[PDB]
Design a protein around this ligand. Structure first.
Ligand SMILES: Cc1nc(C(=O)O)sc1CCOP(=O)(O)O
Ligand SMILES: Cc1nc(C(=O)O)sc1CCOP(=O)(O)O
Ligand SMILES: Cc1nc(C(=O)O)sc1CCOP(=O)(O)O
Ligand SMILES: C=C1C=NC(C(F)(F)F)=NC1=N
Ligand SMILES: C=C1C=NC(C(F)(F)F)=NC1=N
Ligand SMILES: C=C1C=NC(C(F)(F)F)=NC1=N
Ligand SMILES: [Mg+2]
Ligand SMILES: [Mg+2]
Ligand SMILES: [Mg+2]
Lengths: 507, 507, 507
């Protein structure tokens, strides 16, 4: 027998019979998975008969204990005791947890997807681990009573385990993880205070349904025990010098970055001007087949603008297209909590991939963070940490938080809370979505060993800067706009940030 | 809690929510049958989730103990332990019995329908009761692995509970039992030594799916603790006197029985000739729709004869019709273990209803008993007993056994073994299917107070007696037949048995 | 038996047997509706056998005569003669009018939907009443041979009734009327000379299909004999004074109204800036679900721009949305008579809800009127009264007609003809879609107590004034645009209407 503090939840394998490829057995795959790094195993039989169930639990319990890996059994507690399994794992509609413990003394997993559930797990006291929500969409779970909750929904849970100090309860992520997201799920599924993250990733069809369980399992292992998530080929690491702003503007000019705008029509003419003005080239393509090719172009950058007529399967593909190539996405959730359809949509978009920067104004940034002038600072930090990103917040003061944290993940440095991440301010006195376009361009020109945080900061300066200049040569809102673009053009051409009006301080 | 000795299996109610009539509830029904008959209650939930299960099992355990009746739980032993059930009932493909008892110490049931299963039950020594095979076909059990077994099947199981002598184990019959067959089932489901019969009848749909459980349970009860099954409207209760054979032949003549022949085309024209001899009326309808109107007609009799190219859907329809009217049925299994399709077919027919007589010869009688001359006696006895009927076996001698037993059933008198039942013999020195036709005519004309056993014997005599007479006036196979029909005519007209050739002894 | 002049058309209920809620009878509905407001019944049986039809017309003619209400029969006139009915309603495909009149002498209703039908109903002399076209789409008319016509088409018909002086003819409108459109139908369905209006509303599925005929009938009555259609939460009532254009430009700035533009691409970026310059906020949403939320936002306003790629179902949704909250809609039929598809689409939109302003040019406004300088005034005035709206005609001069008549409606003050309404004009000497956006913004800012008319005027002035000024400060097409926005910016900021170039006269 094992002990609670002996279980290793790193790569937890949940089983499925009707899914194994033709000519391969359940024993066949599960072995391949043990040999190559699976570290816990659940047997899951929703359909078979109590006798065959047992017959195969004994055949697989043997296989496991030979690799010194435990064996949990799904919702059939009796079967579990029957065969001396090492733990059972029940969901929300199964046997109450108190009753389960009154027939065993041994490890229990509870399927949680909501904070309220964690509350009750705690009004119980030392339930030993929990499967966290359905992170993504998956057709492995027949007739499901929840919904793809996202990494944000899984954070909301990790966070309730801290409010409750439920130190005793481990966690695993489950529901549609494959190598195209495992990294991002590990990377953002962390409590705000930074003290706790996931204890392990849990797959079913990525191994069970693989032609090559061996190969597939070695990959997941590889993602799982690595600690740097390099999501965009730019460095992620002390105020921004003028000479830094400089070479940033040099690189972006020397590189002619192609910036793909998926935005409405209004922001569209304007945006492509600002991009052009910065020595870059806009592309307003929202065509799905094309998305793979644009992103492949050198120094290519994507700009996202909630509610743009483009169908979500295409924003999904767009985002994905670019994280595949390690390239920068800037996200501008214009709408947000303004409406029903928009809250819902952004939250969906935010689960499609990793963003390099999210820009919004006081209302937008406050909504995203789930919460003045001090308060703004607070919420920007909150959002930058919560989506692991550079998060800009605009207004008279622009605040710029860096929550990427070098791009480090782990299974519980993680220790750097929300409130410790560096955040700056940019002021120029009293004077939109063209900010998006600016940042996008700045970031897009940066070379390998460049820097993401400085780049965004340069962008917010360059923009706020041009704002003053234009603000002073306008005759009205009409001419301000054409002057704003002009200023942006002249400003980046005379590369002398030392002569710029906007002052950059610490938040 | 209860004790194994206190469980009453009289009327055993098994549960099924997905079948309950609109407007009514499980509690609804399960209450009604508690007030009106049920004596034991099993919860069956093959679909619902482990929580909901427990919720409704607790809700019903209270409803039961409220009537001092127990509550068994189907296949889910943990749910039993959890809610403090009084027993669990598993299947052949559910948890092994060893493992179950290693979790509990409380009653266990076991669904059986094959002597080998009883053989193992026995090599375990004191498993507590068994649900006996599928008796009849039922669409309540979704996707089944057995096949309906009939009373013949149930017997073969009871018969292994004595061979292995498992005093300690009780039995209930299950599946397809309705009011149209509970009597017949109770009646012929007794062990071959008469000692052990069923201890309970077990229904699911006859109550649960009833637009009035209250009424339906009252009726089921009425049957189960009644003790006389009067299947034919004739008496059933010391050698046959010449005066008895005489008033038998008068009755059939003064009654002109209508004898419906469902038989092949070669015994067809013949048998009609015999029936006509005996002052009866042949009708040869293998029409389904007509069957019930034919049985209406006064003193109507039915004669079956395997392999008559009427659909079994008709033979079922037909047999049923005459038992609903308590009229007699002669059964002749011409074919039998001669081929395959025949054995199959006869066995299915034998499950359709209750026969007043089963005639056959040497090969047939021996096949039916599942087993010379002392041997035919022992075999005729077995057949008679087994199918609770008067059994004629033809040859040199004709042996006639009476295994009806006044129509008695019990839930374990029943103790009147095979060997004991009355068996006579009729000889007449060295002299076919017309016997059946004759037997049918003799039984047909008896009135409520007449006696089935005598009627048959008269038949065999009369016939055996036309035998001698025609053997004498024949010139070969052709005229022998025409003199046999002729003799039969003369013999019954000059009704004076005091003169006929054959000797009736005591086998 | 009633008289011709004793028929109360107010609320004319038509029958339908197949559409009645399980549990209620036809008697039930009709009765219910009788007590609560119905003033005429017509039986309608396109299916049932003439015996059963009749059993029902009597039963029902009784229930009607008890509440002193007449009963008409549809098209089966013999059935009317047969049961002593008060009138028959026939259609266009039914028995010629003369032939009916030759067999009865009684009241006769005719389903009309085009002027031609009126011309015929005219050169016949004293047909009693007509049922007017199909106003809105409906599935209660199985296999329809017409096409929904809208209140627009209904007016065409009401106008042939004057060109013909058919003073002997009543009208009722029929076809898909429910509480979300009775008011509007009652309000705009009036003769071009205003001398004639509708004599009642006819509903089928609203009462007959209601799960509460009682309540549905009370509501409909409530609306039919009210006299105020307050359709926009603004005033509706002597040249517009400088002080007023000034208090107007304040309300709009101080209230920053959210203006939703459903327009193409080319009026999008441009239109958004005009909105911006006016201190109000652009929303480019063509999202079908947001549209309810957008209109719940304060001082919110909608601008339609025919042909905008937005699906017609969305335009309906959107238009409905704003009327349900009483917020103003600005309609700009750019395309119009230009093509086929456009003319078609524009008329579909016009019958969707109630607009507060329709802007358009010489071409557009001449088209809408179904019809220089003395001419545009005559046409502008028409388009205002026909669609009960403040209607603007851009050109060298700009013409504004207020045809909303305090929002009054009747059953025939109605009498204030196309010519009578106020029409003012706006000159600035010899100097695009911006005007819509401007007017949308003036109207949007207006509070409970404002006045839709002045607001519209203000906008036109402000837009015209802006023109003279940019026409002065421009060096070409492009500069002109940007100078136009600026002038609106400046002009409104220094809210000083006394000093504007454009002169406001009576037209
Ligand atoms: C068995 C099970 N429970 C889930 C939950 O949502 O909590 S997901 C899941 C299976 C999904 O895994 P995959 O996509 O790797 O097959
Ligand atoms: C649950 C179950 N087991 C069976 C077996 O053949 O062992 S039959 C059966 C259900 C049959 O019930 P009814 O026909 O009365 O609805
Ligand atoms: C019988 C009949 N003729 C119509 C026409 O348009 O001429 S409409 C109509 C019935 C439709 O009523 P509702 O849509 O209010 O249920
Ligand atoms: C619904 C489930 C949720 N979580 C887990 C796991 F993490 F594997 F324990 N298994 C499940 N079957
Ligand atoms: C398959 C079954 C067989 N027998 C019984 C009973 F007899 F009631 F115990 N219940 C079952 N569900
Ligand atoms: C087709 C119809 C048109 N109009 C009317 C009425 F309500 F009488 F005006 N009834 C009809 N059945
Ligand atoms: Mg479960
Ligand atoms: Mg079972
Ligand atoms: Mg008609």
């Amino acid at each position: 027998k094992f002990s609670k503090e002996q279980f290793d939840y790193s790569l937890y394998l949940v089983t499925d019979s009707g899914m194994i490829p033709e000519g391969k057995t359940l024993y066949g795959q599960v072995e391949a998975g043990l040999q190559n790094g699976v570290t816990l195993v659940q047997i899951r039989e929703k359909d078979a008969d109590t006798k065959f169930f047992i017959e195969e639990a004994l055949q697989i319990k043997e296989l496991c204990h030979a690799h010194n890996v435990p064996l949990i059994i799904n919702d059939r507690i009796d079967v579990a005791m029957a065969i001396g399994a090492d733990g059972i794992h029940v969901g929300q509609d199964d046997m109450p947890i108190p009753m389960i413990r009154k027939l065993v003394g041994m490890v229990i997993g509870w399927s949680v997807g909501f904070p309220e559930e964690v509350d009750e797990l705690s009004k119980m006291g030392p339930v030993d681990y929990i499967g966290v929500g359905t992170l993504f969409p998956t057709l492995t779970k027949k007739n499901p009573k929840k919904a793809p909750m996202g990494t944000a929904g899984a954070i909301r849970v990790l966070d309730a385990l801290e409010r409750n100090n439920a130190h005793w309860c481990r966690t695993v992520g489950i529901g549609g993880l494959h190598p195209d997201n495992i990294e991002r799920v590990l990377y953002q599924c962390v409590s705000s205070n930074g003290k706790r993250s996931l204890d392990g990733i849990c797959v079913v069809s990525d191994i069970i349904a693989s032609l090559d369980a061996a190969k597939s399992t070695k990959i997941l292992r590889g993602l799982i025990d690595k600690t740097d998530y390099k999501f965009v080929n730019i460095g992620l690491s002390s105020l921004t010098t003028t000479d830094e702003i400089q070479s940033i503007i040099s690189n972006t000019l020397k590189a002619r970055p192609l910036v793909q705008h998926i935005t409405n029509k209004v922001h569209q003419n304007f945006g492509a001007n600002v991009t052009l003005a910065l020595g870059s080239s806009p592309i307003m393509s929202e065509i799905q087949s094309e998305v793979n090719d644009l992103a492949a172009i050198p120094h290519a950058t994507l700009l996202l603008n909630t509610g743009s007529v483009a169908p979500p399967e295409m924003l999904k593909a767009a985002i994905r297209a670019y994280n595949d190539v390690k390239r920068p996405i800037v996200f501008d959730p214009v709408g947000y909590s303004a409406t029903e359809t928009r809250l819902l949509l952004n939250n969906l978009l935010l689960t499609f991939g990793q963003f390099s920067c999210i820009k919004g104004n006081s209302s937008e940034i406050l909504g995203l963070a789930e919460l003045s002038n001090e308060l703004l600072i607070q919420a920007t930090k909150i959002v930058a940490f919560k989506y692991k990103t550079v998060a800009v917040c605009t207004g008279e003061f622009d605040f710029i938080a860096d929550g990427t944290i070098e791009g480090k993940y782990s299974l519980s440095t993680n220790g750097t809370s929300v409130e410790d991440i560096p955040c700056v301010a940019v002021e120029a006195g009293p004077i939109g979505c063209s900010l998006g376009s600016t940042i996008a361009c700045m970031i897009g020109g940066q070379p390998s060993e460049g820097n993401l945080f400085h780049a965004v900061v340069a962008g917010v300066m360059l923009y706020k800067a041009a704002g003053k200049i234009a603000s002073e040569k306008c005759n009205g809102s009409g001419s301000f706009q054409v002057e704003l673009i002009d200023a942006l053009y002249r400003l980046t051409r005379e590369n002398t940030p030392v002569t710029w009006a906007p002052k950059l301080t610490h938040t």
